[PDB]
Write a protein that binds this DNA or RNA. Sequence first.
RNA 1: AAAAAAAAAA
RNA 2: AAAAAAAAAA
RNA 3: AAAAAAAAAA
RNA 4: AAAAAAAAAA
RNA 5: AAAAAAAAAA
RNA 6: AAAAAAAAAA
RNA 7: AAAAAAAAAA
RNA 8: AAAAAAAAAA
RNA 9: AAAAAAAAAA
RNA 10: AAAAAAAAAA
RNA 11: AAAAAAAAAA
RNA 12: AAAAAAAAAA
RNA 13: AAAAAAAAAA
RNA 14: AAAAAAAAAA
Lengths: 144, 144, 144, 144, 144, 144, 144
Amino acid sequence: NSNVVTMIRAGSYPKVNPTPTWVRAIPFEVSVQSGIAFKVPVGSLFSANFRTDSFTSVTVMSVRAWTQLTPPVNEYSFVRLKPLFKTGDSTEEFEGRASNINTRASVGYRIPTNLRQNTVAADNVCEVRSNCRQVALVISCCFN
Amino acid sequence: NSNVVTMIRAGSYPKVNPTPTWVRAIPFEVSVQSGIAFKVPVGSLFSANFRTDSFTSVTVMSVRAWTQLTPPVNEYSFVRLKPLFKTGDSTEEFEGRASNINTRASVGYRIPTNLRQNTVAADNVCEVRSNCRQVALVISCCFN
Amino acid sequence: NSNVVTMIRAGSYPKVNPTPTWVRAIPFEVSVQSGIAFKVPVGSLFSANFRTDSFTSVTVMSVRAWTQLTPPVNEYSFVRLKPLFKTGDSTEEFEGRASNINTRASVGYRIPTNLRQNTVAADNVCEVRSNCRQVALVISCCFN
Amino acid sequence: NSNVVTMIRAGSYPKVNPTPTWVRAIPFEVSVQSGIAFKVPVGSLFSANFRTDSFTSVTVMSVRAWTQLTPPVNEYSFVRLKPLFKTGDSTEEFEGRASNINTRASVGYRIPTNLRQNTVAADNVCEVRSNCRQVALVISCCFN
Amino acid sequence: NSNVVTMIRAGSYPKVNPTPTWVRAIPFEVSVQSGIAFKVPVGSLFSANFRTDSFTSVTVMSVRAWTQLTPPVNEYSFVRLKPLFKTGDSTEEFEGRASNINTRASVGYRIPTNLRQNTVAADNVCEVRSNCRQVALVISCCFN
Amino acid sequence: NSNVVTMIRAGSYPKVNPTPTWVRAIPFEVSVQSGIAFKVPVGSLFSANFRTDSFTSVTVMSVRAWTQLTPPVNEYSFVRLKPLFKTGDSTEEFEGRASNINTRASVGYRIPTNLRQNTVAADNVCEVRSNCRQVALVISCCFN
Amino acid sequence: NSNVVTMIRAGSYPKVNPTPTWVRAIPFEVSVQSGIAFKVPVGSLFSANFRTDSFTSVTVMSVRAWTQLTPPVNEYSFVRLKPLFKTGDSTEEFEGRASNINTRASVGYRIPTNLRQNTVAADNVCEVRSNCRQVALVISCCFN
RNA sequence: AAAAAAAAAA
RNA sequence: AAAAAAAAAA
RNA sequence: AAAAAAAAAA
RNA sequence: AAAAAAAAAA
RNA sequence: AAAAAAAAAA
RNA sequence: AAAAAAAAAA
RNA sequence: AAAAAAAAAA
RNA sequence: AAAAAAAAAA
RNA sequence: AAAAAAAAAA
RNA sequence: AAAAAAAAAA
RNA sequence: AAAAAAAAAA
RNA sequence: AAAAAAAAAA
RNA sequence: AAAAAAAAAA
RNA sequence: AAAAAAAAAA
Ligand SMILES: [Mg+2]
């Protein structure tokens, strides 16, 4: 291959965009109480910690959740997700349970194309229920 | 295709990275004086205006330059690029000229693999000369 | 085939969901006045009569309508449907007419993928007009 | 694909059913005492928690069971299932044991076609034995 | 081919619609001031000048823009487009620049299927920025 | 498919037309006396009710007619169409009759290419005769 | 194709005929009394209402008949045709009956080649019988 | 499956 | 015969 | 797709 | 042999 | 079926 | 390469 | 894709 | 059409 | 050449 | 997919 | 990749 | 191996 | 030779 | 015979 700088024969000025979209997998944790649902706010996805603080909207594609701390004594971990939407909340309760007490439970759901509109910081993604005090989420989304 | 949320059968917690790399084409302008070379600082690529203020290093891959304002009366636009590098500056003067007084002049150079190390805000990309008072740059780079 | 119970060699505890989605064709009637349009509420679709009282949202896919009573003397039955949407109402008036006075008139419309968002009880599906005093609807939808 | 509503050329009024059947996998737990068998009532499957409170009969196809709490000290989890039938109870004791003390034990059984009649709330599905204080069941059935 | 009127053997009365949908490319102009973004209202698309005054909703599919007057002295024309959405505004700034001072600058963007819902007169399509005092827009859209 | 807005690399300003042509099937009704021909005016086709009030000309391609009310006692419906043209009226009498007293009569005629000139609101399409007091027309035409 | 008049290189004066033959399907109605046969006169086919008043002879090829008014209460329509010929009358009674009280009855017969001689106004085609007071006839014939 | 009108593309 | 939902399986 | 009547053509 | 108009057919 | 002049096209 | 108009030809 | 100048190689 | 980054899949 | 909307057809 | 035990069949 | 339930379709 | 976003190429 | 129940296997 | 740098070309 080349070992020196070489000339590019550029032409006209291209179409440009200083502030493009970005397809991402955002990891973050939320704290949960026993037997009480926690609504996950979209605003959690806008943070300098993720290089995403310059965005104001995001299109969520899929949501996956793991338990992040150990469960109560005698119990296996579990986590439930209930999808939420601005045009109408769901009542599905997708649930995963561990089969080894020392292991995370996990579950996720995919959002269909007809429901992939933008959300803003004030919106919510889903409700989380778990017998563990922390749940780790990984959300796949397109920032725009 | 599906019209409702569906279950994902997630497994172990994956490898994650909250602060990933980003391949970009960054557009910005600089002011140049007649007969005086202008050193383009790498720090210009780190700005909230480009969603890149969270990075501190970047690997520049190629530089393209267009004249941005009209040339002096009776002349055609021209722009020159001289590559700069921390381990040793170049003396090439890649030059483009307009063939129509009303049109931009353009030129670019590609940086070879063996010279694609990181730069930081205090470093310089290249020297620009032009008979126009502004030059528009589009730099292809990998933020990391 | 087997005539007795046989063992299943079950494995880890699976992903579960106690409240799944349901793809349905719901049949109900509405009362129509002459010359006056009737707005069909989405809330009609949530009812123990359909096994759907546990849902709060629904994604409507297609609407079909039939006249359910005889037309006025000398007339042939007709029915019109005007689609309604929360992001903006349509002005189409899909219309079916009977070619035999003793026969139902019918018409339907399909909602495109890009408009299949959720609707809740307070929302409306469409407007119905008819010269018959009742209209029977069958709505294809996904409860979620 | 289409971006707007389009007409459907509906025909005669179709055959309809407002209360269809539903093929389901229902997950619930039961409390078990040491040394004592627990009869699992069919009535557990009818509940608003499963969107099934509108059904009065169900045809059970297969039963699967997992231990839901940790076993006694020094022991590995186990669970046994004895199938029950209105025309005559079985004496099989399908049994699963854990090979890791921290792991659920599991077992299931399939009901043959010739024994898939309806069962109502007063009937029983099976007997459960376990050295763990709770057992999680998933039952595959057709509500009708 | 035939030179006279001939008979059609028509059948039963068909499904009809007196107010159908219309796929269109609407051309119009907006006035913009330097350094100020102009929000383009959807209501611009409803006008007798386009035969569209009888619609109240539209699904926007793509937006293209051109500069419509000459740029300031010594400058090349430019135009930026920032998409707007009811469910959440974007921060992209799609930009095109002229390479001959006597030529229009142009740029455009396409709206994805998941974001093609309806918009009414009070909604906005996008923000426009330019150094030219007028910008010509051509919007591909579906009136319904 | 794509889930976010993407750039279009627009070129030169295209050819545009804010007021285009429209191929339509227009349904309307006319009142008829027994034994008396009714001349159907072309102006019926220009109406806000059809989104056509901005057109002043139209090219009729085909005419189809149905009886719209029940026939006199003891009779079967019938309907006759006689084409009219500015350059010379026809004397054809295309006729349809019902074979069931409860059923619409219908007939149609196609206009040949050499006769597809423009007509204006003061022109006439055809003559209608029927033993029913109302006739329903569906005209296929091109508005220009 | 050509858009202007063009020359024909005509030759010798051709064979001509100002009064050609005409294959036609003539529709007309006759009045019938209960229990009485009606002889259909051939003269009914020579009329300005059919553009045939310039013919004095006709060759009848086939005869079809429909009932034209409702039958008496409780009865289904029927119609009978008995062919008549100048060289000798038939005694067949081709009959058709309705299977729905509201629909027309119909029947017809074909005249074989050996019997297709000319007929004039004073001749008869056939005898009609019917329990309906009017019968509609369509006769396929060659005017010469 | 072919065609006309409007839209969009390689 | 293809595709979407819930269930079951090699 | 075949046949009759009228028209036109290689 | 191909086409238009009227008629008839599988 | 080939060619020239004017027009129009993929 | 196909077509229209004028011309010319086997 | 072919050629010249400089460099490197099987 | 090939390659790099992020995302997603059999 | 493929697709959407309106129209027409075997 | 092959085999042993019990059952059943062309 | 095959089969059962509810939905939709050529 | 197929797809989306950003980049680059024939 | 195909199938059901129990057992054993690549 | 393949490649890099500079030049020139279809
Ligand atoms: Mg009937």
